[PDB]
Amino acid sequence: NDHQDLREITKDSKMQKLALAGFLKKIKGTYIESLLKEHKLL
């Protein structure tokens, strides 16, 4: 089970930190980890 929240136009720093948080976790079990390692983004 899960709940994927809706995305619209919001440049509020806290909302961006929520976006960044969920990003930072999902990295460990998504293809994006590979991209960040290979492209040296991390």
CB 13 within 8 A of CB 20: no
Of 37, 31, 32, 34, which is closest to residue 20 (Cα–Cα)?
32
Within a 13 Å sphere around the CA of 21, how many CA atoms are in the beta-carbon half?
6
CA 7, CA 40: separation in Å to the nearest integer?
A: 27
Structural domain spans, the chain: 10-42
Q: Are 24 and 30 in contact (CB under 8 A)?
A: no
Q: What is the C-alpha to C-alpha distance for residues 42 and 23, in angstroms, rounded to an integer?
A: 13
DSSP the chain: --------S---HHHHHHHHHHHHHHGGGSTHHHHHHHTT--
CA dist., res. 28 & res. 14, Å (int): 22
Q: Which of helix, strand or coil describes residue 29?
A: helix
User: How were these coordinates obtained?
Assistant: NMR
